[PDB]
Amino acid sequence: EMQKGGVIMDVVNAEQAKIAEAAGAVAVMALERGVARMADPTVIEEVMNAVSIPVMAKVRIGHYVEARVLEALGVDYIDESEVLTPADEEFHIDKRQFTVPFVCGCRDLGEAARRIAEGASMLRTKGEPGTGNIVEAVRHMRKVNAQIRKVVNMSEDELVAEAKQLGAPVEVLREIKRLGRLPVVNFAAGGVTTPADAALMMHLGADGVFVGSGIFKSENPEKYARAIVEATTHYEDYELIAHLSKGL
C-alpha cells in the first residue's frame, strides 16, 4: 500500500541506503546519477541487498523493456520517471501488464487519471526537478487537490463533460467521486528541501514526500534525513519542526 506519511529517499549506493533506512525512510529510490537511462542493475542490487525496506528504481517514460528488466531484478516499485530522458514522447508504459507496481508523475488531475488508467499504483505530484524550489511541488499539489475537491462535490451528471475538459477517463473521475480522493497514494516531489517544506506538502494534502540526493550533500545526512522524516510524520507539530530546523 506504501505507508502514508512516509518519506522516500534517493540513494546512489549501499551506504546512503542504510542511512536512509536508519533515518526512518519508508522506501529508497536507487539511482546511478546527455541521455539518462535505467541504472546499471549492479547498482540496484547493491541497494536491494543493503536494506530491508522497499526499493524503487526509475525507468525512462515508455521504456517497456527497462521496466521488464527491473521487474526481473526483483525491484519493489518501478518509477516511470520524467527526470530520466523520455524514450517515448506519446505513449507511457502499459503498466497493467506488470506484476510490480508503478509510481508515475503528474501535474494535474487529467494526467493523474491517465496514469491511473495505464495501471499506475501510485502517484508523484511534481513540477520541475533539481531546483531546491518547493513552488513546483506546491503548484501541482494545489492544482491536483483543488481539481479533486471539485470532482468530489460536483453534480454527478456533469462528470462526463468534466472528464472531456480535463482529458481524464470518466471512470477514474467516478471512482474519485465515490472515494472522496484518489484511488492511489499521491506523494509530493520537487524541491522538498527543509523540514518545513516537507510538512507544508502534508498540509497541502500530500500522502508523503520524495526527497533527493541533497540530503547526502549535507554535513550530517543522518540528522537531516531524520529531520525530514519526523517533520513529515508530525507535520502539525510546529514546535518540533522549529527545533528540527535549527541544526540544518
Ligand X SMILES: O=C[C@H](O)[C@H](O)[C@H](O)COP(=O)(O)O
Ligand Y SMILES: C[As](C)(=O)[O-]
- Using CB under 6 A, pick the residue from 66, 80, 111, 197 that binds ligand X: 111
Asked if 136 interacts with ligand X (CB under 6 A), we say no
Distance CA 124, CA 247 (A): 28
Among 6, 54, 105, 191, binds ligand X (CB under 6 A): 105
From residue 100 to residue 119, the character string flagging contacts with ligand Y as x (rule: CB under 6 A) and all else as - is -----------x--x-----
Query: Directed axis angle between helix 14-23 and helix 41-50, to 10°?
Result: 40
The binder of 82, among ligand X, a copy of itself, ligand Y, none, by C-beta within 5 to 8 A per type, is ligand X
3-state secondary structure of 129: coil
Q: Which of 80, 82, 162, 207 binds ligand X (CB under 6 A)?
A: 82
**x/- map, 161-200, ligand X, by CB under 6 A:** ---x------------------------------------
Residue 60 interacts with ligand Y (CB under 6 A)? no
Q: In terms of CB distance, is 21 or 109 closer to a copy of itself?
A: 109
What is the gyration radius of the CA atoms in the chain, in angstroms?
Answer: 18
Q: In terms of C-beta density within 10 A (0-12 exposed, 13-18 middle, 19 or more buried), how is residue 113 classed?
A: buried
Separation between Cα atoms, residue 35 and residue 234, nearest integer Å: 39
Tell me: does residue 61 bind ligand X (CB under 6 A). Answer: yes
Q: 179 Cβ partners below 8 Å, 6+ apart?
A: none
Separation of CA 217 from chain center: 21
Residues 184 and 161 sit within 8 Å (Cβ to Cβ): no
| Residue 65 contacts which entry, ligand Y, ligand X, a copy of itself, none (Cβ below 5-8 A, type-dependent) | a copy of itself
Q: How many residues bind ligand Y (CB under 6 A)?
A: 2
The torsion of the CA quartet 12, 188, 224, 49, rounded to 10 degrees, works out to: -30
* 171, interface contact from ligand X, a copy of itself, ligand Y, none, CB < 5-8 Å by kind: a copy of itself
Sign of CA dihedral 81, 211, 189, 76: positive
Q: Which residues bind ligand Y (CB under 6 A)?
A: 111, 114
Q: Which residues bind ligand X (CB under 6 A)?
A: 61, 82, 86, 105-107, 111, 114, 164
Binding site, by residue number, is 10, 130, 142, 191, 212-213
